[PDB]
Amino acid sequence: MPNFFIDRPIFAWVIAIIIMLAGGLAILKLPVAQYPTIAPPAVTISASYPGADAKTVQDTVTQVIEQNMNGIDNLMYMSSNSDSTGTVQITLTFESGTDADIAQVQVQNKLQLAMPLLPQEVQQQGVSVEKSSSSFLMVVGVINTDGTMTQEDISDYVAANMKDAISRTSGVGDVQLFGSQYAMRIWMNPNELNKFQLTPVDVITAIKAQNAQVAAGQLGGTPPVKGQQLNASIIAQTRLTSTEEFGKILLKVNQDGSRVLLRDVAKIELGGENYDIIAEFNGQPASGLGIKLATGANALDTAAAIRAELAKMEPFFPSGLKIVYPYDTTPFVKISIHEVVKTLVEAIILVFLVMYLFLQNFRATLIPTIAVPVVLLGTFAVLAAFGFSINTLTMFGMVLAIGLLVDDAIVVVENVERVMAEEGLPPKEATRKSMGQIQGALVGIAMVLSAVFVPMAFFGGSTGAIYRQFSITIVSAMALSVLVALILTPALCATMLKPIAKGDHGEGKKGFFGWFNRMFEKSTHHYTDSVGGILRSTGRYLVLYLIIVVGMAYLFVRLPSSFLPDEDQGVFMTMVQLPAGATQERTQKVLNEVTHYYLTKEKNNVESVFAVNGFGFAGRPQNTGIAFVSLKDWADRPGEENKVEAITMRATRAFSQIKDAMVFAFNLPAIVELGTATGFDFELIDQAGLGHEKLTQARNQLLAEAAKHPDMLTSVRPNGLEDTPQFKIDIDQEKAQALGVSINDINTTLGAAWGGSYVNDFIDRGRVKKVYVMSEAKYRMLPDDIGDWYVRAADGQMVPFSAFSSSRWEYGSPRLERYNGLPSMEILGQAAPGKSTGEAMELMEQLASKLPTGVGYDWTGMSYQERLSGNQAPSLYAISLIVVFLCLAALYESWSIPFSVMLVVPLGVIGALLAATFRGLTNDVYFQVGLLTTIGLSAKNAILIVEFAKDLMDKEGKGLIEATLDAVRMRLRPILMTSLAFILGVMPLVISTGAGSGAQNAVGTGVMGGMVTATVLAIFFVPVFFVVVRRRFS
Amino acid sequence: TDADIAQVQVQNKLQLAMPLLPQEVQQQGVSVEKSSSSFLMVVGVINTDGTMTQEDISDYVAANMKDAISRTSGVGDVQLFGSQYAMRIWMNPNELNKFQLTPVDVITAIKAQNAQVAAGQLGGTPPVKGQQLNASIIAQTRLT
Amino acid sequence: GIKLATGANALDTAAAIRAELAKMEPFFPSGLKIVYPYDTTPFVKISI
Amino acid sequence: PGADAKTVQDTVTQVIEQNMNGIDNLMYMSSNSDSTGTVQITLTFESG
Amino acid sequence: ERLSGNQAPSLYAISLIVVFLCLAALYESWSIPFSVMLVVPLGVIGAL
Amino acid sequence: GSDLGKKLLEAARAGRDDEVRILMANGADVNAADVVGWTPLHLAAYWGHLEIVEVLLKNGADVNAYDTLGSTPLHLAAHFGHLEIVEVLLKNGADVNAKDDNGITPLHLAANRGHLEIVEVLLKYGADVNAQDKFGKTAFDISINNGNEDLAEILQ
Ligand SMILES: CCCCCCCCCCCCCCCCCCCC(=O)O[C@H](COC(=O)CCCCCCCCCCCCCC)COP(=O)(O)OCCN
Ligand SMILES: CCCCCCCCCCCCO[C@@H]1O[C@H](CO)[C@@H](O[C@H]2O[C@H](CO)[C@@H](O)[C@H](O)[C@H]2O)[C@H](O)[C@H]1O
Ligand SMILES: CCCCCCCCCCCCO[C@H]1O[C@H](CO)[C@@H](O[C@H]2O[C@H](CO)[C@@H](O)[C@H](O)[C@H]2O)[C@H](O)[C@H]1O
Ligand SMILES: CN(C)c1ccc(O)c2c1C[C@H]1C[C@H]3[C@H](N(C)C)C(O)=C(C(N)=O)C(=O)[C@@]3(O)C(O)=C1C2=O
Ligand SMILES: CCCCCCCCCCCCCCCC(=O)OC[C@H](O)COP(=O)(O)OCCN
Ligand SMILES: CCCCCCCCCC(=O)OC[C@H](CO)OC(=O)CCCCCCCCC
Ligand SMILES: CCCCCCCCCCCCCC
Ligand SMILES: CCCCCCCCCC[N+](C)(C)[O-]
Ligand SMILES: CCCCCCCCCCCC
Ligand SMILES: CCCCCCCCCC
Ligand SMILES: CCCCCCCCCC
Ligand SMILES: CCCCCCCC
Ligand SMILES: CCCCCC
Ligand SMILES: CCCCCC
Ligand SMILES: [Cl-]
Ligand code: NA
């Protein structure tokens, strides 16, 4: 095939051109995102029950929905939260590869048939079924600076004039409002209600009567009286539109004839649907939009389009309103692209310099300069074909393959330049013979590297989907590199390279290039003498090899494991946790202190603090909040002291002073769904109807025991909330019936006043919005206020709540958890320093088998996937090793010689482990894929040494030592050229301290160190391996 | 035919009929299933000691086993060979007439006195300034 | 009485049912025991 | 039933339409709201 | 109709390039392709 | 409310005997109360931690401390069936006829939850069997309404 294309250089160019256009087209049309979809498909069912406690929500909503989630395909597990904010979230997680649309529609179809079983108030609110995801493209803040608008006012403006337009913007997949559109808030006064012998029941009845759509009919409607000339619609009562109209709603006509209006017994204003969250941006009221990227969309185009649409809205903004961008991924993703293109261009430049340094003609330097781009473009065309995106994983996958692509180019050209210098053949005849020597090996290498990388694509779960991104990227780039090496490069060599007279090694030249050729020819004789000496005493090198193998194994176990490096993304999070039962105002005072620290102590670094009061990740009661800190641009934060990690640690140490409030700052993870390094996710399950209290005792018993093994387990805590004081009120049924007071009137009055009640909808400036009745704050704060609410009896007398009720303090759950339909409590933790997650999980299981009767357990999230991903590893390692052996066996026509190649693996791995360990890095994904490519290139170097050596023995009948010495002599220049170019090529990634430097450092460090040892050791050890293996087997 | 799309198309049409169906039929739950007419297997459950009656075993299966089996992928339908327990009010017409009551009065009382009420919070949002107490109000809960 | 979902694999589904019953057994009341009075899958497994 | 086109548009058509975002291969969306209370929202998708 | 007209120029352009490259590969020549592809206007004017 | 007061409330609740011991040695406020007026003794009485009830009373805890609705530790212990704690509280001078704001007594609560052993102890320490709540209900009225045959016979 190389012979075919040496005589047909135009056909070769045509193939290169088709590949280039396909790739050029792919580069324009390929999606762009920071990260691809990794986590398995999850569907969330969300429902609201205004004024409902955790148990009410669980026993009227959660249990009914859970009992109806049957006959749905590919469900792995199901988990739910029911909490005292009147909220339920059920999450159904599906097998990796499940169609998310079919999963969602199957879930919401089974929900639809369960809807008639839910309370009327829940059916009225509705039950959302959504595709679950946590990766926002950006967060657009909307603030008011002139103090004329509350967060409720901004939320309504954004909902009415911004949200829909952003949802319609090109590439926008989803938009979450940080707030609600206005609600008509009827704030009831029980003093005024009792004055006119009225209750919340009468308020609700009147609103439903006097705020409603009423169907009428038509004038001259069909069937008509023949001769009818006019046909027109009759418009009757339509919904109210203003606070004024709601104010004038008639409640009572008194004996004397005066009117009791709704404004006489209530304050009436446009407010929020909920008052749980208080959002501030640098102390100013704030709403905002959480924007997610649509499937297959370009992140950079979408972000531009969003900013373009926001620009068009600028002129209509009320005075004081302003757009802010506290979170935007696209600046970071744009730097990733720039830095990768920069690395690939520098790589090509370094190959040009190294090619000229050794071969010293511009015609030679042009051949890799053509071949490498053709492969890189071709790789994009194949990625597009597999439906992959340009993302962090696929981009760094190409960087990790640079060494393999550069080598294919250098190997083919250098070997032609040598054959011409040693034999005197003209370029065309030299290229034919040169390809004749390597073409069989190039195909062998392709199969070996396929055997190495292809099995990496068949890991299951989240980590599998990450490894799959690198696997296809690297195999594709490698596969095209070999096709270009057998088609284009030979044709280019045959037609572009000038002849070299037999014996001309450029020693006769003058200047630097004359000196260099003399030095390098002299250095090649020093090398062949050294191998000569090494091969006379092979015994002590087999000893040095086992010292390396043991040193490797030792360094492997000591190297801490992780997933993806933390990055400076110009943002981080501060958690604010007060003691249980702490009020919104107490949490606000702590957030004001946290915000004040960042705008004082970090005025150089911090751009904004987004303070969300009454929001948490494991429930959002009044005692929880978060401060989202956005930093100034990377340029204006020089040095390690002004980066996220340093600011995080300083903030955490300052806030540990704060009394009766757990406050700490932390960097965001690369991908949220992966979790912490060697963390676990444990579920304790009530399997025999024990109940909340007995499951709590069992949880505490497990926690107490886990604390006694700090050598194995660290930070083993519950994810949920502790039981809190709650106000049990008992309605005396006999007293109610005796006074002629209905239970409906009692339960409505209590619920409406203290909990709130969604009555019906009104239309505010052409937009349908909700009407809520609730007590004004001051009449629903303390137990004494219960007595101030009156209910009208059948006989018309007003009866206070005190007359027919009794109350007491008890403890109950503000958040009840369920796993696969049964009561549960989620326990988080991680393996101790030096211990594996497997060991930590094994102990937790052992401890769990000692808990009371009817208490079971299960693993979820990352722990579920680790158990199913860990069991695949042995099989995939084994298949890789077996197919590599079989491919080399076929190449060399020998069961033994393969071992001489395969023995190279540790020579690269030892340098990677030394460099990672020394620089204080982890055994992360980037490092691991780095080992495979380092192993891959060292294997390639070894394969060609052994092929050359074996050919000289088979064809020219030379001796083992003679063949081995002639082989390593010929392979020295190309091996050093590739290594010099590639090591220099990754040097910028190692020293990088900018944005995305975490990833660059992880890719660079392990590869640099691995290549240094792989290069230096292999040139001495590969000849030893071949001699020992040939001796031992005939 | 893709059974997933068949089920989806059949249910889209069922949801148009659902509101026209009697409320008693809606509350029993209408089910849409894609399964074989024949049984894959019968999982039997007995008590070797004889500590539990047919009815007790049937309740345990329904309350502790059926749901998890019904959610398992590939399980198209699950038939309980027995009944889950309900709270059975066995009415006496002689006693109902004696106290001048009907089944209507019985049903009204059970709805009134076996209720799970949303009662709101003490110090609930939006609160007054200087509020220190925040507690859930618990009223009527389901009878047990 | 379990019926196979349209197009689902009988043997894979039977294995998943047994695995789910295995998780319930340890928390059974005293005397309660699973019996296998009718299974169509053993014949498929054995005949193959 | 009984609602005018304007009422129907504000309470139904716009409510549905503002949720018809982030759907794959959507070319355009057209709708009408009429005096008999009827809404029709047609979503046309790309060829194939 | 708008779509059909908008994409026609790029369709003709890629179609001409592909036919040229195919001819260049089959006849291991640039001169034969260039010589042949010059005939296209002679056909296109007759169609118009 | 002090630092150690809050620590003692949490420890008394959690039943961490060894931590309560250390807190008693450092003089953690035994009369410390949360926002609903619950002392460490209230919490220990509720969650049924006998050892801590004894240790708190040794360290001068108010046996008749009442919450913001007039409920005492004896109310809690009687209601939740903690027989041993009821005996200890009564031996350390707990008001057996203590009335909350609803006029409810330990006897009322124990009768309601059918704790026969606790009812006998309360009557032994001179619980007023004729004591009426705000609805004029006795422990006997509760026993017949609940249909508790054994209990109704004891409250003769
Ligand atoms: C995967 C399983 C799934 C099933 C797939 C089934 C197909 C398996 C692949 C089939 C490959 C067999 C190759 C058949 C070639 C027959 C030609 C015989 C003549 C000959 O000497 O071969 C020359 C080429 O070989 C050479 O001169 C090559 C150099 C010597 C061998 C090089 C070894 C190649 C690298 C091996 C990599 C390992 C692969 C592992 C699978 C061509 O001569 P000619 O006939 O044109 O001459 C004109 C004579 N009148
Ligand atoms: C921190 C990095 C450490 C990496 C590990 C080191 C391995 C890589 C360096 C290899 C250097 C080889 O250096 C080579 O060693 C052999 C020793 O067998 C010497 O060989 C010497 O001893 C042998 C055995 O008695 C004699 O046959 C030979 O005549 C004599 O010269 C070579 O003259 C020397 O050039
Ligand atoms: C608008 C952007 C949204 C981003 C969502 C962020 C998701 C975080 C939710 C969980 C937060 C609760 O806090 C909990 O999770 C954090 C994950 O970041 C943990 O943080 C952990 O992982 C981080 C990875 O970047 C590391 O930098 C920390 O050293 C490590 O401790 C905290 O130790 C833990 O207390
Ligand atoms: C958690 N999240 C990102 C934020 C951040 C800042 C905010 O200022 C807010 C949120 C959540 C949203 C949720 C929305 C929700 N919805 C979309 C209307 C909602 O139903 C509630 C609720 N308590 O049910 C809100 O509080 C809410 O109105 C709200 O006030 C929010 C809000 O103000
Ligand atoms: C995007 C479309 C791709 C079309 C590519 C066309 C090829 C040329 C590209 C321009 C680069 C500049 C140099 C090109 C020279 C080039 O292609 O022309 C050189 C002569 O025409 C060769 O004539 P011929 O007698 O056929 O030689 C063949 C020998 N058997
Ligand atoms: C030339 C012979 C190479 C054999 C090694 C190939 C093993 C790769 C197996 C596989 O597909 O898993 C990829 C894996 C996913 O995390 O990536 C890795 O974690 C890298 C594994 C390196 C192991 C070094 C071996 C040293 C002892 C011989
Ligand atoms: C060319 C390489 C092919 C790789 C195929 C891997 C499939 C192996 C399945 C792993 C699961 C086995 C569990 C015991
Ligand atoms: C972008 C395509 C450039 C193609 C130019 C290659 C010219 C090859 C001609 C070689 N020749 C036949 C003269 O030897
Ligand atoms: C899993 C199969 C591995 C293949 C090993 C074959 C080795 C054959 C040795 C023959 C010696 C003469
Ligand atoms: C899960 C599918 C994995 C297939 C990998 C094959 C890659 C070949 C690229 C040319
Ligand atoms: C005495 C040790 C000699 C080693 C010299 C090796 C030369 C390698 C040049 C690339
Ligand atoms: C429109 C954005 C194109 C970015 C191309 C990136 C190539 C690696
Ligand atoms: C003779 C070269 C073989 C190449 C097949 C991929
Ligand atoms: C339509 C222009 C074609 C001419 C090619 C040389
Ligand atoms: Cl030159
Ligand atoms: Na009721």
Residue numbers in the entry:
A (entry chain B): 1 to 1034
B (entry chain A): 98 to 241
C (entry chain A): 290 to 337
D (entry chain C): 50 to 97
E (entry chain C): 866 to 913
F (entry chain D): 11 to 166
Provide passages from the article that reported this PDB entry.
Here, we present 13 X-ray structures of AcrB in intermediate states of the transport cycle.
In an attempt to prevent ansamycin binding, we made the switch loop more rigid by Gly619 and/or Gly621 to Pro substitutions. We assume that the Gly619Pro and Gly621Pro substitutions induce a switch loop conformation mimicking a transition state during wild-type L to T conformer conversion while the HMW drug is bound to the AP.
